[PDB]
Each structure stands twice: as structure tokens, then as C-alpha cells.
Design a binder for this molecule. Structure first.
Ligand SMILES: *[C@@H]1O[C@H](CO)[C@@H](O[C@@H]2O[C@H](CO)[C@@H](O)[C@H](O)[C@H]2NC(C)=O)[C@H](O)[C@H]1NC(C)=O
Ligand SMILES: *[C@@H]1O[C@H](CO)[C@@H](O)[C@H](O)[C@H]1NC(C)=O
Ligand SMILES: *[C@@H]1O[C@H](CO)[C@@H](O)[C@H](O)[C@H]1NC(C)=O
Ligand SMILES: *[C@@H]1O[C@H](CO)[C@@H](O)[C@H](O)[C@H]1NC(C)=O
Lengths: 47, 79, 99, 113, 44, 49, 49, 50
């Protein structure tokens, strides 16, 4: 079960800037001392 | 792939012969460049050449490689 | 050193390109020739293997031509170096601005 | 569709060139001869001062017609043109190079022989 | 021309004026110094 | 399958090299890192007097 | 088949241009040697300048 | 004379290699085009001829 809330004064959402964030492993392989480029969904920098 | 390769084994022979000719040509290049003389001349033990310092181009006995320091630097500079 | 580095880097990148050429299907449905042989019927499998061999044979000829041109350039440079050795090193050369 | 200065005989609709490309067509509305020129294209180039010297770069266009300086080798942006001449190091073409000189920014100048 | 089909030409690094200047400088050196300017400083 | 001296992060099963060739695969049941090397190949050259 | 034929024509043009560039390099080296010897001094090589 | 013999042998071997390459099928069902023309119709045998 759930209940409803009441109207109140809230704050508008703000916008911030990312700084070298949103990088993960695009695969499950081991790569040492190489520069490998892949096409995959990531987070833009300075967005 | 080999059962289809007999239709182009002649091209394979041509490319193999071209590679062999390239290899023997580069082998002959060193003979035409460095093998100018057939007598190996030993450096004299006396280093008094009137004041000319030749230790930077002559080999040194301090290292087992017996490569001149200029030649050793050239070897180390290029990968 | 510039002259001694290009002759190695070009050969290394040509070998890398030759390695990478095996990763392309050349318009077929697979890159490795084992998958089509182990997945499809023998009569139909002969038209994808033919595509693969044609693509790799086309790849194997441009490298040969480039190596032949590079070998000709190396021969010219080696002849120039041998003449320079035999003149400036093996005696004194009267040619001005040559040694 | 530029305005041509050559007229056609009163029985033709098309027009080709030496390279056999349709580059001239008569407008059927008012019998006006209009040229055909292919739309602009080219390749971008990057002028780099080098590693451990600077960070900013300049963008060079090959044959595209347009801070911004119109060179004889295309369009150059990001490099300020200066009238004086020094010895250049990074070639561009048509007798003008680019270099990083005094802060300090990338400049373009004619070579000194 | 031959540039409508993506076959763009590259302008030369040295324009004809610069090659003319180089040839004129070589001519002046070879008529005012002989071979001294080709193997060191120019000598009149 | 030789015995290697390089460890793998505890989420990877494959492994490649500079030339992009699978030459290092972790064995799944005891977690050893083993290298892959082609057996041998070459040519039969002969010297004739 | 259009891509394959166009690639063949482009490769043939590239090989022809490379051969022409090698010939141009030989001619330019000859011209540079001639400028270094016959122009930048007097050359003792008979029937060369 | 090694050089003249070598260049003559290279030219002769290249010409003989071309002649024997004319005797190859290049993955087709025959080498000579006349056999394919006589045994198969030109509308169907166009791909082999190509
Ligand atoms: C010839 O040049 C070499 C330079 O490599 C001289 O060797 C140096 O000599 C000084 C003087 O004692 C030493 O401090 C250096 O450590 C030496 N360097 C090396 C690399 O050995 C050598 O003395 C010179 N010989 C003559 C006769 O002038
Ligand atoms: C480039 O375009 C401008 C405006 O479109 C024009 O004034 C200028 O003449 C053009 N440059 C050349 C070289 O035609
Ligand atoms: C460079 O100096 C000349 C001298 O008359 C002048 O005409 C020209 O405008 C100057 N260029 C710049 C960019 O200051
Ligand atoms: C695999 O399972 C066996 C038992 O089934 C166990 O003894 C062994 O340690 C396991 N290997 C691992 C966890 O790497």
C-alpha cells in the first residue's frame, strides 16, 4: 500500500558540469600497454 | 583453402620469388656497402697520432661489445 | 634519427595492416573461414570461401608491390652510400659539395 | 546555379565540358543558361606546435573558400597572420608556413629564403 | 579542369617566385664569388 | 599452454596483445593464467655443394 | 563489383604514380648532384656537365 | 656472365608463367572460354566468363 503526499514549496532542479566521469570497462578482456578504441555508450566529458 | 589455392599458386610463386629476390638484394647491399676491403686492418696500439684524439670512433676494449661509443650511442638512439 | 626510423615503422605498420586484413569479411558473412564451414551447408559454403580467398589475395599483392618499391629505393640509397664510401672514405674526392 | 556568359544554339537543352560532365543546362522557364558547379568539399588539417610547447591548435582547409586568414592554400583559422617573415618550420604550402612565436600564439607568415 | 571528381591538386610548397629568387641568388653567388660561397662564406 | 607471470583482474576471462590476437586465457576451474603460442612452422631449406 | 573495380583502378593509378615518383626522385637526385658539382664549383668529371 | 643470364631467365620465366596462368581456371569449372561457350549458354555462363 502507498499514500499520497501534500503540496509544498520545493526547489527547481539545477544543472552541473561533469569532469572526467562516466568511464567503465567496455568488455571483459585484458589489455596491457595498448591504446584500443571501441564504439560503445559512454558519458560525454564537459557536458 | 588449399583445394582452391591451386588456381593462384602461380601468383603465390611470383610473390614468393619477389620476396626472395628482395631478401637476397638486401643481403647483397651490405656486401656492396661495407665489404670494400678484404684485409682486416688492426688498430695500432700506439694512440699518438700527432695530437688527434681517435678514441671516439675507434673501438674500446673496456666493453665486451667492442663498439665505438659513437656507434653505441647510435644503436641506443634508434629503436 | 629520421631516415632509420621510417624504414622500420613503415614495415611494422604494413605487417599490422596485413594482420588486420584477416579481420574483415570482404563482403561475406564471417571473417574466420572456420565458422562458415562449421555452420553452413557444403554446397553454399564454397561461395563465401571464394570471396575470402579473393579478398586476401587482393590484400597480398599491394604489400608485395609496396615492398618492391621500397626495395628499389633501398637499392638506390645503398648504391649512393657505396659510392660515397668508395670516394670520400676510400680516398679523397674532388667533387665539391658531395662529401 | 551561376549566371553564364555563353549562349546555346536554339535546339539544345544540355551542355558538357572537356571532362564530359554536365555543367551547363538551359532553364526551360525563360531560356536562361545556368552553369553547374559541384558543391564545396575538402579535408581539414591541424597545425600542432608540438608536445610540451603549446596546447592550442589551428585548423586548415585545403581548397575551401571562407583569427581567420585567407591564404593561397585554402582557409586558415586559429592563426593570426603577421607581415614580417622568419624561417618557418611547419610547412603549409604556397610559400607560407605556420609557427608558434610570441603571450605566445600560433602565427602564419611568408617564408624567408 | 580535373578537380570536379574529388581529384584535388596540392599547391607546391615553393612558388615560382621563390624558385626564381633561389636561381637568381645562385647566379649572383656564382658570378661574384665562384665556388667560395658553395663551400663556405662568400669571397669576392 | 605455458605458465605466465602476469596476473589478471578478477573479472576477465580473455586476453589479447598489441597485434590483437587472443594469446592469454584464464583457466576457469583453478584460476591460472595460461598463454597461447602457435606450435611451430617453417621451411625446409637445403644446402647443396 | 563496382567497389572492386574502382579499387583495382585506384591501385593501378597508385602504382603508376609511385613508379613516376621514383623516376622523379632519381631525376631530382641527378639534378641536385649536377647543381652541387657543375654549378657550385668546377667539376673534373669529363662529359658530365 | 651472371647478370645477362639472370635477366634473360627472369623474362623467359615471367612469360612462361603468364602462359601457364592462361591454363588456370581461377576458381571456375574450366580454363579455356571455348569449352564453357560450347557447353553452356552465354546468358548462364556470363559469370564464369567474367
Ligand atoms: C679523447 O676524448 C675522450 C672523450 O671521450 C677523453 O676521455 C675523457 O678524458 C677525461 C680526462 O681525464 C675524463 O675526465 C673523461 O671521463 C673521459 N671520458 C671518457 C668517455 O672516457 C680522452 O681523455 C681524450 N684523449 C686524449 C688523448 O685527448
Ligand atoms: C570567397 O568568397 C567571398 C564571398 O563569397 C568572395 O568575395 C571571394 O572572392 C571568394 N574568394 C575567391 C578566391 O574567389
Ligand atoms: C605589415 O606592414 C605593411 C607595411 O606597409 C602594411 O602595409 C601591412 O598592413 C602590415 N600588415 C599587418 C598585418 O600589420
Ligand atoms: C570448481 O569446483 C570444484 C568442486 O566442484 C572445487 O573443488 C574447485 O575449487 C572449483 N574451482 C574454483 C573455485 O576455481
Amino acid at each position: 500500500q502507498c499514500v499520497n503526499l501534500t503540496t509544498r514549496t520545493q526547489l527547481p532542479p539545477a544543472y552541473t558540469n561533469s569532469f572526467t566521469r562516466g568511464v567503465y570497462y567496455p568488455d571483459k578482456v585484458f589489455r596491457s600497454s595498448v591504446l584500443h578504441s571501441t564504439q560503445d555508450l559512454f558519458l560525454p566529458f564537459f557536458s | 583453402c588449399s583445394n582452391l589455392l591451386l588456381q593462384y599458386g602461380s601468383f603465390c610463386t611470383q610473390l614468393n620469388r619477389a620476396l626472395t629476390g628482395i631478401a637476397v638484394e638486401q643481403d647483397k647491399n651490405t656486401q656492396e656497402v661495407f665489404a670494400q676491403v678484404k684485409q682486416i686492418y688492426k688498430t695500432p696500439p700506439i694512440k699518438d697520432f700527432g695530437g688527434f684524439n681517435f678514441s671516439q670512433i675507434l673501438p674500446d676494449p673496456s666493453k665486451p661489445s667492442k663498439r665505438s661509443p659513437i656507434e653505441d650511442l647510435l644503436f641506443n638512439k634508434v629503436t | 634519427l629520421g631516415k632509420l626510423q621510417d624504414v622500420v615503422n613503415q614495415n611494422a605498420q604494413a605487417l599490422n595492416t596485413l594482420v588486420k586484413q584477416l579481420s574483415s569479411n570482404f563482403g561475406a558473412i564471417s571473417s574466420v573461414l572456420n565458422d562458415i564451414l562449421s555452420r553452413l551447408d557444403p554446397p553454399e559454403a564454397e561461395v563465401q570461401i571464394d570471396r575470402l580467398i579473393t579478398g586476401r589475395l587482393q590484400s597480398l599483392q599491394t604489400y608485395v608491390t609496396q615492398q618492391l618499391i621500397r626495395a628499389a629505393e633501398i637499392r638506390a640509397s645503398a648504391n649512393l652510400a657505396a659510392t660515397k664510401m668508395s670516394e670520400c672514405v676510400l680516398g679523397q674526392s674532388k667533387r665539391v659539395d658531395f662529401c | 546555379l551561376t549566371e553564364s556568359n555563353k549562349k546555346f544554339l536554339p535546339f539544345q537543352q544540355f551542355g558538357r565540358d572537356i571532362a564530359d560532365t554536365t555543367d551547363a543546362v538551359r532553364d526551360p522557364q525563360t531560356l536562361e543558361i545556368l552553369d553547374i558547379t559541384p558543391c564545396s568539399f575538402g579535408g581539414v588539417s591541424v597545425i600542432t606546435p608540438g608536445t610540451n610547447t603549446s596546447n592550442q591548435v589551428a585548423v586548415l582547409y585545403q581548397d575551401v573558400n571562407c583569427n581567420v586568414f585567407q591564404t593561397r592554400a585554402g582557409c586558415l583559422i586559429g592563426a593570426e597572420h603577421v607581415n614580417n617573415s622568419y624561417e618557418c618550420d611547419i610547412p603549409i604550402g604556397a610559400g607560407i608556413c605556420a609557427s608558434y612565436q610570441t603571450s605566445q600564439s600560433i602565427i602564419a607568415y611568408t617564408m624567408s629564403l | 579542369a580535373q578537380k570536379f571528381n574529388g581529384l584535388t591538386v596540392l599547391p607546391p610548397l615553393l612558388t615560382d617566385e621563390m624558385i626564381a629568387q633561389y636561381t637568381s641568388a645562385l647566379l649572383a653567388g656564382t658570378i661574384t664569388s665562384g665556388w667560395t660561397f658553395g663551400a663556405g662564406p662568400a669571397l669576392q
